Design a protein around this ligand. Sequence first.
Ligand SMILES: CCc1ccccc1-c1cc(=O)c(O)c(C(=O)O)[nH]1
Ligand SMILES: [Mn+2]
Ligand SMILES: [Mn+2]
Length: 175
Amino acid sequence: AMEDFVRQCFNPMIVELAEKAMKEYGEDPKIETNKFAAICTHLEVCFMYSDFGLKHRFEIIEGRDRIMAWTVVNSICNTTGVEKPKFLPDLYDYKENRFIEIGVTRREVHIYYLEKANKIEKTHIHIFSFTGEEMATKADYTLDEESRARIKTRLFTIRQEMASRSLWDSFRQSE
Ligand SMILES: CCc1ccccc1-c1cc(=O)c(O)c(C(=O)O)[nH]1
Ligand SMILES: [Mn+2]
Ligand SMILES: [Mn+2]
């Protein structure tokens, strides 16, 4: 089952967070399994991305309840002067001095890029596929190659584990 795989392939903190995220908004991870899998996969990227950092470079925003995430965002604007977003993003960059929206997609990276860019407004956008393909505003990929390489391998691995269990098709197609 998709669901089994999620518990079997993600650190509980991430599963627990993804469950909480879904079940609060009234979604069943036992039914909406592929969303469950996707939500986990996103958090993890986000956490990975965050913790590949000026010792501490990134502010993690995804993961937090909405009260916290907006505190962290309101705190950040007051002290740096960068514009407040209309939509909570995934990260802030304390070096390059901008918020980051992380996209993960099982479609072409340029398509999921444009969707993102459409929704927003001075947020750096960085998209990862599961084919180890990326795309980021002004092709500024924000991170040293070794860090970007770990994400791509992870996402690829998650693709390939799904495919062991005949899941990739379900998942690829439900975006
Ligand atoms: C996490 C995947 C997802 C599925 C359905 C609706 C929204 C989202 C989503 C995608 C994102 O990239 C993202 O940053 C968020 C978010 O809540 O911040 N949500
Ligand atoms: Mn987000
Ligand atoms: Mn995101």
